């Protein structure tokens, strides 16, 4: 999306969602591999990705002057 102003949006999000989002959307990991990394049910990984992307969307919307 924007610049690596991303590390900075992401850091504004709770740790749990932030890691799911970084791993999925910055690093390109598969939800099943992220479930291994995080040691959580894949369905938990998905729920954090949704909450996490929800917030994120909320920021780049604000970044519409």
Curated annotation (Swiss-Prot):
<feature type="region of interest" description="Sigma-70 factor domain-4">
    <location>
        <begin position="6"/>
        <end position="56"/>
    </location>
</feature>
<comment type="subunit">
    <text>Interacts transiently with the RNA polymerase catalytic core formed by RpoA, RpoB, RpoC and RpoZ (2 alpha, 1 beta, 1 beta' and 1 omega subunit) to form the RNA polymerase holoenzyme that can initiate transcription. Interacts with cognate anti-sigma factor RsrA under reducing but not oxiding conditions, which prevents it from binding to RNA polymerase. Treatment with the thiol-oxidzing agent diamide inhibits the interaction.</text>
</comment>
<protein>
    <recommendedName>
        <fullName>ECF RNA polymerase sigma factor SigR</fullName>
    </recommendedName>
</protein>
<comment type="similarity">
    <text>Belongs to the sigma-70 factor family. ECF subfamily.</text>
</comment>
<comment type="function">
    <text>Sigma factors are initiation factors that promote the attachment of RNA polymerase to specific initiation sites and are then released. Extracytoplasmic function (ECF) sigma factors are held in an inactive form by an anti-sigma factor (RsrA) until released. Responds to thiol-oxidative stress, involved in regulation of about 30 genes and operons, including the thioredoxin system (trxB-trxA, trxC), ribosomal protein L31, RNA polymerase-binding protein RbpA and mycothiol (MSH) biosynthetic (mshA) and recycling genes (mca).</text>
</comment>
<feature type="DNA-binding region" description="H-T-H motif">
    <location>
        <begin position="31"/>
        <end position="50"/>
    </location>
</feature>
């Amino acid at each position: 999306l924007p610049d690596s102003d991303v590390k900075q949006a992401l850091q504004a999000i709770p740790e749990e969602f932030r890691i799911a989002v970084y791993l999925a959307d910055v690093e390109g990991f598969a939800y099943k591999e992220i479930a291994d990394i995080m040691g959580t049910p894949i369905g938990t990984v998905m729920s954090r990705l949704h909450r996490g992307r929800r917030q994120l969307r909320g920021m780049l919307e604000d970044y519409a002057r």
